[PDB]
Design an enzyme around this catalytic site. Structure first.
Site, PDB file in Angstrom:
ATOM      1  N   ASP A 132       0.820  -1.211   0.000  1.00 25.49           N
ATOM      2  CA  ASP A 132       0.000   0.000   0.000  1.00 25.49           C
ATOM      3  C   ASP A 132       0.849   1.254   0.000  1.00 25.49           C
ATOM      4  O   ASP A 132       1.849   1.333   0.704  1.00 25.49           O
ATOM      5  CB  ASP A 132      -0.983   0.031   1.177  1.00 25.49           C
ATOM      6  CG  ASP A 132      -2.080   1.073   0.988  1.00 25.49           C
ATOM      7  OD1 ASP A 132      -2.778   1.037  -0.053  1.00 25.49           O
ATOM      8  OD2 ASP A 132      -2.248   1.928   1.883  1.00 25.49           O
ATOM      9  N   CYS A 149     -12.191   4.081   1.872  1.00 22.50           N
ATOM     10  CA  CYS A 149     -13.320   4.024   2.806  1.00 22.50           C
ATOM     11  C   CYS A 149     -12.903   4.367   4.242  1.00 22.50           C
ATOM     12  O   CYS A 149     -13.517   5.217   4.898  1.00 22.50           O
ATOM     13  CB  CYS A 149     -13.956   2.635   2.774  1.00 22.50           C
ATOM     14  SG  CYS A 149     -15.428   2.476   3.829  1.00 22.50           S
ATOM     15  N   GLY A 153     -13.328   8.308   3.122  1.00 18.40           N
ATOM     16  CA  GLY A 153     -14.534   7.792   2.482  1.00 18.40           C
ATOM     17  C   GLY A 153     -15.621   7.469   3.482  1.00 18.40           C
ATOM     18  O   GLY A 153     -15.948   8.313   4.320  1.00 18.40           O
ATOM     19  N   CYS A 154     -16.161   6.242   3.412  1.00 19.64           N
ATOM     20  CA  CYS A 154     -17.359   5.868   4.196  1.00 19.64           C
ATOM     21  C   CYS A 154     -17.247   6.180   5.686  1.00 19.64           C
ATOM     22  O   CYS A 154     -18.194   6.674   6.283  1.00 19.64           O
ATOM     23  CB  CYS A 154     -17.713   4.375   4.066  1.00 19.64           C
ATOM     24  SG  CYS A 154     -16.901   3.428   2.764  1.00 19.64           S
ATOM     25  N   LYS A 157     -16.880  10.082   6.505  1.00 24.87           N
ATOM     26  CA  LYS A 157     -18.125  10.653   5.958  1.00 24.87           C
ATOM     27  C   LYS A 157     -19.305  10.369   6.899  1.00 24.87           C
ATOM     28  O   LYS A 157     -20.047  11.287   7.260  1.00 24.87           O
ATOM     29  CB  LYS A 157     -18.398  10.095   4.538  1.00 24.87           C
ATOM     30  CG  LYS A 157     -19.754  10.424   3.894  1.00 24.87           C
ATOM     31  CD  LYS A 157     -20.943   9.562   4.383  1.00 24.87           C
ATOM     32  CE  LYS A 157     -20.894   8.095   3.952  1.00 24.87           C
ATOM     33  NZ  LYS A 157     -20.965   7.893   2.463  1.00 24.87           N
ATOM     34  N   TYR A 291     -23.101  11.602  -5.195  1.00 26.87           N
ATOM     35  CA  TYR A 291     -23.483  11.302  -3.817  1.00 26.87           C
ATOM     36  C   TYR A 291     -22.456  11.860  -2.825  1.00 26.87           C
ATOM     37  O   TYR A 291     -22.825  12.282  -1.738  1.00 26.87           O
ATOM     38  CB  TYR A 291     -23.775   9.807  -3.588  1.00 26.87           C
ATOM     39  CG  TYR A 291     -22.584   8.887  -3.396  1.00 26.87           C
ATOM     40  CD1 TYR A 291     -22.118   8.091  -4.442  1.00 26.87           C
ATOM     41  CD2 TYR A 291     -21.955   8.776  -2.151  1.00 26.87           C
ATOM     42  CE1 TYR A 291     -21.030   7.222  -4.261  1.00 26.87           C
ATOM     43  CE2 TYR A 291     -20.872   7.916  -1.961  1.00 26.87           C
ATOM     44  CZ  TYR A 291     -20.419   7.141  -3.017  1.00 26.87           C
ATOM     45  OH  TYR A 291     -19.351   6.292  -2.823  1.00 26.87           O
ATOM     46  N   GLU A 295     -23.495  14.547   0.069  1.00 34.76           N
ATOM     47  CA  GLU A 295     -23.236  14.100   1.441  1.00 34.76           C
ATOM     48  C   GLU A 295     -22.395  15.119   2.202  1.00 34.76           C
ATOM     49  O   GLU A 295     -22.711  15.476   3.346  1.00 34.76           O
ATOM     50  CB  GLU A 295     -22.561  12.719   1.461  1.00 34.76           C
ATOM     51  CG  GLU A 295     -23.527  11.543   1.195  1.00 34.76           C
ATOM     52  CD  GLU A 295     -22.827  10.189   1.127  1.00 34.76           C
ATOM     53  OE1 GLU A 295     -21.581  10.145   1.066  1.00 34.76           O
ATOM     54  OE2 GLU A 295     -23.518   9.148   1.135  1.00 34.76           O
ATOM     55  N   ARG A 312     -24.198  21.319 -12.584  1.00 32.79           N
ATOM     56  CA  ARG A 312     -24.118  21.439 -14.041  1.00 32.79           C
ATOM     57  C   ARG A 312     -25.435  21.062 -14.719  1.00 32.79           C
ATOM     58  O   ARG A 312     -25.976  21.846 -15.506  1.00 32.79           O
ATOM     59  CB  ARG A 312     -22.980  20.563 -14.579  1.00 32.79           C
ATOM     60  CG  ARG A 312     -22.766  20.648 -16.089  1.00 32.79           C
ATOM     61  CD  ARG A 312     -21.665  19.698 -16.559  1.00 32.79           C
ATOM     62  NE  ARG A 312     -20.337  20.096 -16.080  1.00 32.79           N
ATOM     63  CZ  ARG A 312     -19.654  19.470 -15.123  1.00 32.79           C
ATOM     64  NH1 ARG A 312     -20.157  18.397 -14.524  1.00 32.79           N
ATOM     65  NH2 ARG A 312     -18.458  19.918 -14.764  1.00 32.79           N
ATOM     66  N   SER A 313     -25.937  19.863 -14.416  1.00 35.93           N
ATOM     67  CA  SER A 313     -27.171  19.360 -15.016  1.00 35.93           C
ATOM     68  C   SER A 313     -28.144  18.838 -13.959  1.00 35.93           C
ATOM     69  O   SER A 313     -29.052  19.558 -13.539  1.00 35.93           O
ATOM     70  CB  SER A 313     -26.870  18.275 -16.060  1.00 35.93           C
ATOM     71  OG  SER A 313     -26.097  17.221 -15.506  1.00 35.93           O
ATOM     72  N   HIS A 566     -44.106  -2.456  14.743  1.00 40.42           N
ATOM     73  CA  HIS A 566     -44.629  -1.134  15.079  1.00 40.42           C
ATOM     74  C   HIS A 566     -44.095  -0.697  16.436  1.00 40.42           C
ATOM     75  O   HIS A 566     -44.001  -1.518  17.351  1.00 40.42           O
ATOM     76  CB  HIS A 566     -46.159  -1.205  15.116  1.00 40.42           C
ATOM     77  CG  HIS A 566     -46.836   0.113  15.335  1.00 40.42           C
ATOM     78  ND1 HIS A 566     -46.851   1.112  14.387  1.00 40.42           N
ATOM     79  CD2 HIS A 566     -47.557   0.577  16.384  1.00 40.42           C
ATOM     80  CE1 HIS A 566     -47.543   2.140  14.845  1.00 40.42           C
ATOM     81  NE2 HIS A 566     -47.983   1.840  16.056  1.00 40.42           N
ATOM     82  N   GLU A 571     -41.821  -0.606   8.604  1.00 36.36           N
ATOM     83  CA  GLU A 571     -43.117  -1.302   8.496  1.00 36.36           C
ATOM     84  C   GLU A 571     -44.008  -0.790   7.360  1.00 36.36           C
ATOM     85  O   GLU A 571     -44.871  -1.520   6.872  1.00 36.36           O
ATOM     86  CB  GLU A 571     -43.880  -1.281   9.828  1.00 36.36           C
ATOM     87  CG  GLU A 571     -44.418   0.088  10.232  1.00 36.36           C
ATOM     88  CD  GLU A 571     -45.282   0.047  11.480  1.00 36.36           C
ATOM     89  OE1 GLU A 571     -46.106  -0.886  11.626  1.00 36.36           O
ATOM     90  OE2 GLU A 571     -45.144   0.966  12.313  1.00 36.36           O
TER      91      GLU A 571
END
Ligand SMILES: Cc1cc2nc3c(=O)[nH]c(=O)nc-3n(C[C@H](O)[C@H](O)[C@H](O)COP(=O)(O)OP(=O)(O)OC[C@H]3O[C@@H](n4cnc5c(N)ncnc54)[C@H](O)[C@@H]3O)c2cc1C
Ligand SMILES: Cc1cc2nc3c(=O)[nH]c(=O)nc-3n(C[C@H](O)[C@H](O)[C@H](O)COP(=O)(O)OP(=O)(O)OC[C@H]3O[C@@H](n4cnc5c(N)ncnc54)[C@H](O)[C@@H]3O)c2cc1C
Lengths: 588, 588
Positions: A132, A149, A153-154, A157, A291, A295, A312-313, A566, A571
């Site tokens: 790495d 991540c 990342g995840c 975040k 996303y 986020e 942009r769009s 419930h 549900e």
């Protein structure tokens, strides 16, 4: 079928024992290997329906049809007496270590996929190395072992997302009877960052410890595949070396893209920089509508930031567009400003980041709307989230023969094989695959099991559930409504939908008719559920369980029969009845 | 099969139209009925696989085999020309209103099941009455329309649970960078109660409006079934009257039990009183170990209460006992005191509730532990949660012929039929059924559809998921480990398990290895998932989706194949590998 499987398994496994569960001699070998600390795969033939046929086919490799039979790197090494002979003569360690290459497996990339693959391979006696290296961002940001991540990342975040959610818990608390002075409460970005970074630090350390404990060689080194079996490595001191491996797994992932505009690389930041940023972003422009863009904009706004998103769009291209609009609408209604149909032209520096008081600098963004009106506004921080890209020119020599697509991603078979047969690719760089952490992990573990333990199971990339952790979360599994209609025709699609309101939101005085769910179903296939979509709190927790049902081929009837729990948000999926075609309002 | 179904459907339906989707004359009748505001069931024969056989069988009732055919209360009333004849002569309203009884349906009980049944029946033209009466608690507490869940059950319980959870969100906020002075924050019980009660008030009103909008007659009256078709009603003024109904649905639910000890009825309270209590319970003893007992003890502790739970034997009898212990351990570790193997003997008043300053009184509880040591302690509030009981001596005359079991609950067929053939029972009073709100609702809606719209579908009472909303929540679907072992033998059961830690808990510095999940599986049945169990935050949201998969017959392989959503708590179910039999630690 059996012959093909056995050939592949013997050819590929590093160390493997063919055995039966009720076999006293097989146990003797197992005990010997365990005492000698020799890890290996085991195939119990009496647990396979073609086990008797396998036993007979083994004679094509060993000349015997009995159990146990031990193999090392494609060669039969012995039955029970033979293995114990090696053991008593102190020859066993040498035999199981004998290899044409330095490693059975070299993993290039120590992220979600690579660590998962490397650890899993080591379990079956594959001599494994994990490389790495984190190339610094243009401003110099770097981080430790674990990949996108874990570091950028995840993990960070979702932690920052939670800091954001706590903002609103503070408001809600008052309505539930908590006495507090909100006018005197503020957020400290840096304190949050320190907490997040401390946790990331424990993960960096944990992964290093994990590799050590699994007897995986970890090299903090930049790897380059220079031939099918040769990996060139460069260490921290810039010393260059070559290691050899039988199987190679490419798991190098992606990095953020920058738009080609003056000032972008010099003054902008990306998600790579944001999660360890030493100063408060302050008034922020997020360029992009991914996303990631939404986020980050979302939690920054909840932490009291003045936040603009330049679009942009459309939002969330590739996601269900009704749901994407709803995600955006919630953000806009809660303070996130959107500069719609707007592109950036130039970023100019007005003030440099204060590195002593940890305060942001200041930037001037120049741009234009599609209507020709000029955009000129000051921001303390500009974040680009305009997508991510593989960087395999940094990883592989073009003469190796690994084919890449137009986007620079690796073209793979359904078992992750590249055009170089001993070389595999997993995670974000695998062309066409959902770019998610659990996908990379599943791919890596399943690949390692096929390579080194004779597994057959492929990774199923279909109907992989997702969750976008915007201020109001969006969970999905399966097809968007538009994709289902395109595929099957409007006449073959029925959509059941409803708004809902979390019970928690009643006393808190939050929105009616904002949270939303739908099931996109195929009429001609017993109302098969093709796509599930939910906008609401804890959307990932809501969605996950349904992904199992969808995998199994859930129909609307299966949802109907199942009883709700419930009181929950989930549900609502059990009692859906309003169809889109009926034109009846989904409101409650 | 077809003949039996059609006979039952014609006999039972109040107003029903047999039709086909591509039938112009059927549309004419539909339009006429819609214009005349006549609600009815519709059966489209071309949408049923035995539709052609049904068409022919209709001649046994009408002498014709064509569509449309309209029926009212067991009698053929006409084809297209005939219905339009009634319409043009102003005879139609009279014909569809003609009945032997005042109502097609009388529902006794306006709670979860009764309201669901009554509203659903009205949709198909059943002339419907819903009776509801709330007998005051011994201290005088009463409430409006909606039943136990709405007023003194799931709704206020979960809202108070949320107030409790917000306590800990306030602590967590600091670790995520929020600056606040917790030493100056306190909770106001009464403010919380007012918020909860305002929401309950909107539900009381909403249900009344709903019945009006569905043309259901709502009577705030105590009902008594005095013969199969006669219901005696007593209004607020104590005026007594009799109404008649064709079908009767008993849906009167249960009320809290009191232990037979001096002072219990006079000085103790139950869940019926707690949710509108005008003063702060303060130092509280909860007597009982039911899910109600633990839920109430839990939120009271989180709202800063000094809370003791008196436990006769075990926690959560009937629930998975490993999970029950874990639920209890978390509560104990967070301040809830447990007086173990302790029974109460006497409650003495020391001080009366202050009705002007809204402060609790004071009580002396005298008891004894199983070891013979005396228990003598002062509590401001004593809450009994020692179970609930039907009260059908208040509802039915013994000469009517409805059979009750040893517990006073109604003995029913699998289609909710009692021993009196026109009389049905749903919800908590239906013997042997899971006592939950969505169960009562499903039972009521499905029953109404069978009675009045020719549906065949029975309510599935198997593998109904549950969630206990203790401080750390416990979700389950299917069998406990002990029940699965008893049923199938230990050798046929495999249990996969793992601890987990919510990502949110890392920065917050909460517990490692406390949250827990398991899948109880049957080895001989392809590792079929028999029971799913999760202790953790948002456990109801986690559990719900899996209930669909379990209903469909999920195996461990289905869980394995399905990809996780990251980062979530639920994803841990997708990668379980540690078995209990292996003896390997579940820790992460
Ligand atoms: C902001 C953001 C939020 C995200 N949130 C989520 C989420 O909530 N849920 C989810 O499922 N997914 C999320 N993702 C996606 C997830 O991070 C990726 O899908 C996942 O990390 C991909 O793993 P990987 O193994 O393919 O590559 P990576 O995790 O990126 O790891 C590759 C590693 O290899 C290293 N490397 C590159 N070249 C070399 C080389 N030549 N030699 C040695 N090492 C090299 C890289 O520096 C990196 O450390 C998010 C991504 C981002 C950017
Ligand atoms: C504290 C507590 C918490 C709970 N939490 C949950 C939860 O989180 N989730 C869940 O699914 N379930 C929960 N439950 C259970 C749920 O409340 C019940 O299962 C559900 O309310 C049962 O509905 P029902 O229609 O059978 O009866 P009920 O809702 O009790 O309604 C019966 C109604 O009929 C009335 N009545 C009685 N006799 C007569 C008469 N003679 N004439 C006219 N009316 C009469 C009653 O007063 C009552 O209003 C909880 C229960 C309690 C006590």
């Amino acid at each position: 079928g059996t012959s093909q499987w056995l050939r592949k398994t013997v050819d590929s496994a590093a160390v493997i024992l063919f055995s039966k569960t009720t076999c006293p001699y097989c146990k003797k070998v197992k005990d010997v290997l365990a005492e000698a600390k020799i890890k290996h795969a085991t195939i119990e033939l009496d647990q396979l329906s073609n086990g008797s046929a396998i036993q007979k086919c083994l004679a094509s490799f060993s000349k015997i049809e009995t159990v146990p039979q031990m193999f090392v790197r494609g060669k039969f090494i012995g039955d029970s007496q033979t293995v114990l002979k090696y053991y008593s003569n102190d020859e066993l360690a040498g035999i199981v270590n004998e290899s044409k290459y330095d490693y059975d497996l070299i993993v290039i990339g120590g992220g979600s996929g690579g660590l998962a693959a490397g650890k899993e391979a080591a379990k079956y006696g594959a001599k494994t190395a994990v490389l790495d290296y984190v190339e610094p961002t243009p401003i110099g940001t770097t981080w430790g072992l674990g990949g996108t991540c874990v570091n950028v990342g995840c993990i960070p975040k979702k932690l920052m997302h939670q800091a954001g959610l706590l903002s609103h818990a503070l408001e809600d608390a008052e309505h539930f009877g908590w006495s507090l002075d909100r006018s005197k409460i503020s957020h400290n970005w840096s304190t949050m960052v320190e907490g997040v970074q401390s946790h990331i630090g424990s993960l960096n350390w944990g992964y290093k410890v994990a590799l050590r404990d699994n007897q995986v060689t970890y090299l903090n080194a930049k790897g380059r595949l220079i031939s099918p079996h040769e990996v060139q490595i460069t260490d921290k001191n810039q010393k260059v070396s070559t290691i050899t491996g039988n199987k190679i797994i490419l798991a190098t992932g992606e990095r953020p893209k920058y738009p080609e505009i003056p000032g972008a690389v010099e003054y902008g930041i990306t998600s790579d920089d944001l999660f360890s940023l030493p100063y408060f972003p302050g008034k922020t422009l997020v360029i992009g509508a991914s996303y990631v863009a939404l986020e980050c904009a979302g939690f920054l706004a909840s932490l009291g930031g003045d936040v603009t998103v330049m679009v942009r769009s459309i939002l969330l291209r590739g996601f269900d567009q009704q749901m994407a609009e709803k995600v955006g609408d919630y953000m806009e209604n809660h303070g996130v400003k959107f500069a719609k149909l707007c592109v950036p032209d130039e970023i100019k520096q007005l003030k440099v980041v204060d590195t002593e008081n940890n305060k942001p600098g200041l930037l001037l963004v120049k741009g234009h709307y599609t209507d020709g009106k000029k955009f000129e506004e000051e921001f303390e921080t500009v974040i680009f989230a305009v997508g991510r890209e593989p960087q395999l020119s940094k990883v592989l020599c073009e003469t190796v023969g690994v084919k890449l697509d137009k986007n620079g991603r690796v073209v793979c078979t359904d078992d992750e094989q590249t055009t170089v047969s001993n070389v595999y690719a997993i995670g974000d760089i695998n062309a066409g695959k959902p770019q998610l952490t659990p996908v990379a992990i599943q791919a890596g573990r399943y690949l390692a099991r096929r390579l080194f333990a004779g597994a057959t199971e492929l990774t199923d990339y279909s109907n992989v559930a997702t969750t976008v952790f915007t201020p109001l979360e969006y969970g999905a599994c399966g097809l968007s409504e538009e994709d289902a209609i395109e595929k099957y025709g409007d006449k073959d699609i029925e959509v059941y939908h409803s708004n809902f309101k979390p019970l928690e939101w009643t006393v808190a005085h939050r929105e009616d008719n904002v949270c939303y769910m739908k099931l996109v179903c195929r009429k001609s296939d017993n109302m098969r559920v093709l796509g599930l979509h939910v906008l609401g709190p804890n959307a990932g927790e809501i969605t996950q369980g349904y992904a199992v049902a969808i995998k199994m081929g859930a129909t609307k009837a299966d949802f109907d029969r199942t009883i709700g729990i419930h009181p929950t948000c989930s549900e609502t999926f059990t009692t859906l009845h309003v169809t889109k075609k009926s034109g009846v309002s989904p409101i409650v």
